[PDB]
């Protein structure tokens, strides 16, 4: 079969745990510095933020791994950064107090560009290489698609619309058949502000969820750009799908706007049987959407550079999910695929919508007008390489059942605090159909402290296998879905049990799952790429210590937990999850 380990148990040591015959190595930290004389890590916290600009960058989170032509020994990989910890960012340990403190935390976002080399059967990082880049939240990025020069993509720095700085809360990934790497804005409105505390902002801002005081970010005292009194429209320039060349390190990255507008997780590749592009994405929000989009042309896999700007014309459309069948351990039912087009689903000047840039820029509202079915929190999405159908966590969701998010169908439990994985198998395997079947695959539960009640979770689901808010997945070639847990690391209560976030390893056509690792305390385990053998399962061990209880992965004296992309192999040196 597909799981060649034993299920190992739940841990709550501040190390990496795994099955028998398996090891871990750190590829690369936080603060690592990519060019050759490069200034080291301070783990005083004192590294400038020019120091942090030429660093791998904080919080890694997603990434992809991209293969050399002609040379099986080397390998670039492009790793989101997604946002920092004031706590050992700072050596005050706080809130920023001054542009400079500013310009350190865009500095730590955005994404990593590295060269890895395989000695020995090992991959390590090439500091030095050519292809070592920063692309970071001050980058200068362009806009292109359909919102691109927009007069809602306008600023008094930027008057065309075209030229935006940054990416960053880069959150998880895409990888085209194109060479090129996705890299997707989730919760950028946590960085705006105001200088006007009492700023009353208009029903697209307040769907999106920002408001006057920043999510505990507070850059806005600092760097104008961020102060919505001020530049309002640099909302608009964040939330979206980023392209990436990893292959040319003096590119410019390009915000593709025919995606859509909202809090990205990642970007799931797929084709039609008629050649075209699609890409599946989830907007994390309690009671968000999930979108699909489908490109005009077809990809021309032989010319890689043909694709170009293949993201800027298509379609983009958001699912709604039926009732189902209401079975209580695999429900499943039919949805249906809604196009987000201006002139079609009552998305109009009657709706608040006078092109297709506001309804893309907007894509939160026009989703609402078609009648998109709120979901409990998409995060990841994948697509088998086996088979075609597509997996979707849905990590969970504590207001489920509140005026406005029913209980039902693919969400079928009030007050979700453990998740569940979504499947959809998209009618006669052409992703170009506009109807599908989903099942939930697995609901996640507690059956140690719920036992026969829906908190329980699945069948699938054991004392011995349990987890809670599956948040990244990755397929390996094998057909092996690979889980990674974002939740409750509490270990008690509903949680009890569950011990350190973990990933874990499940056979998509019988349902089982086993837990294969298990992470540092205080970190989500996030980011998943293999080398091109299978051999090497890149993981990311995100903010370990994000409450002060790690010093993963140096355990220095009272040090500084820094967040790391891990290298895990076989002793015997086999495929990652086969059988020995
Ligand atoms: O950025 V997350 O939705 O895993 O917290
Ligand atoms: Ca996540
Ligand atoms: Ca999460
Ligand atoms: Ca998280
Ligand atoms: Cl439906
Ligand atoms: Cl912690």
Same mark, same amino acid.
């Given at each position: 079969r597909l799981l060649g380990f034993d299920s190992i148990p739940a841990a709550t040591t501040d190390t990496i745990s795994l099955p028998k015959g398996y090891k871990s190595s750190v590829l690369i930290s936080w603060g690592?510095?990519?060019?050759?004389?490069?200034?080291?890590?301070?783990?005083?916290g004192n590294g400038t933020a020019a120091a942090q600009e030429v660093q791998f960058g904080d919080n890694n989170d997603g990434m992809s791994l991209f293969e050399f032509p002609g040379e099986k020994n080397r390998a670039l990989m492009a790793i989101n950064n997604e946002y920092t910890n004031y706590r050992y960012l700072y050596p005050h340990g706080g809130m920023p107090q001054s542009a400079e403190d500013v310009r350190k935390a865009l500095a730590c976002e955005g994404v990593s560009v590295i060269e890895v080399q395989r000695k020995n059967g090992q991959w390590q990082f090439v500091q030095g290489s050519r292809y070592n880049r920063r692309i970071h939240g001050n980058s200068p990025l362009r806009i292109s698609g359909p919102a691109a020069g927009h007069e809602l993509m306008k600023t008094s720095a930027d008057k065309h619309g075209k030229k935006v700085l940054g990416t960053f809360q880069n959150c998880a990934n895409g990888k085209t058949p194109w060479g090129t790497y996705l890299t997707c804005e989730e919760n950028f409105t946590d960085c705006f502000g105001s200088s006007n505390a009492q700023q009353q902002f208009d029903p697209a801002q307040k769907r999106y969820g920002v408001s006057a005081a920043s999510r505990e970010i507070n850059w806005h005292p600092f760097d104008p750009r961020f102060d919505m009194a001020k530049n309002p429209n640099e909302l608009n320039r964040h939330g979206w799908v980023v392209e990436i060349d990893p292959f040319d390190p003096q590119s410019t990255p390009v915000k593709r706007t025919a995606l859509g507008r909202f809090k990205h997780e990642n970007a799931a590749l797929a084709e039609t049987d008629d050649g075209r592009a699609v890409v599946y994405m989830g907007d994390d929000e309690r009671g968000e959407f999930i979108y699909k989009f489908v490109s005009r $042309?077809?990809?021309?896999?032989?010319? +890689?550079?043909?694709?170009?700007?293949?993201? $800027?014309?298509?379609?983009?459309?958001? +699912?709604?999910?039926?009732?189902?069948?209401?079975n209580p351990d695999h429900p499943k039912g039919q949805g249906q695929w809604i196009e987000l087009t201006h002139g079609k689903n009552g998305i109009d000047a009657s709706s608040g919508f006078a092109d297709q840039a506001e309804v893309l820029i907007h894509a939160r509202l026009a989703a609402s007008v078609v009648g998109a079915t709120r979901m409990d929190r998409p995060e990841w999405i994948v697509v088998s390489p086996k088979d075609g159908q597509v997996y979707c966590t849905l990590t969970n969701n504590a207001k489920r059942g509140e005026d406005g998010q029913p209980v039902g169908g693919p969400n079928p439990r009030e007050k979700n605090v453990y998740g569940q994985i979504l499947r959809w198998r998209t009618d006669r395997d052409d992703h170009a159909s506009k109807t599908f079947a989903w099942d939930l695959f697995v609901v996640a539960g507690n059956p140690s402290v719920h036992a026969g009640t829906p908190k329980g979770g699945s069948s699938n689901i054991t004392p011995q296998n349990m987890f809670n808010s599956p948040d990244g997945l990755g397929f390996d070639k094998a057909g092996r879905l690979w889980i990674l847990t974002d939740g409750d690391s509490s270990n008690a209560g509903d949680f009890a049990g569950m011990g350190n976030n973990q990933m874990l390893c499940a056979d998509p056509a019988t349902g089982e799952i086993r837990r294969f690792m298990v992470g540092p305390i205080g970190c989500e385990v996030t980011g998943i790429s293999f080398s091109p053998d299978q051999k090497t399962l890149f993981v990311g061990i995100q903010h370990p210590g994000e409450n002060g209880g790690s010093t993963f992965p140096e355990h220095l004296p009272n040090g500084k937990p820094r967040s790391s992309v891990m290298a895990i192999t076989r002793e015997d040196g086999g495929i990652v999850g086969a059988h020995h």
């Open positions: 690592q510095p990519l060019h050759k004389n490069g200034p080291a890590f301070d783990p005083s $042309d077809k990809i021309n896999h032989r010319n +890689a550079k043909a694709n170009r700007d293949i993201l $800027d014309h298509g379609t983009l459309y958001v +699912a709604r999910f039926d009732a189902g069948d209401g």
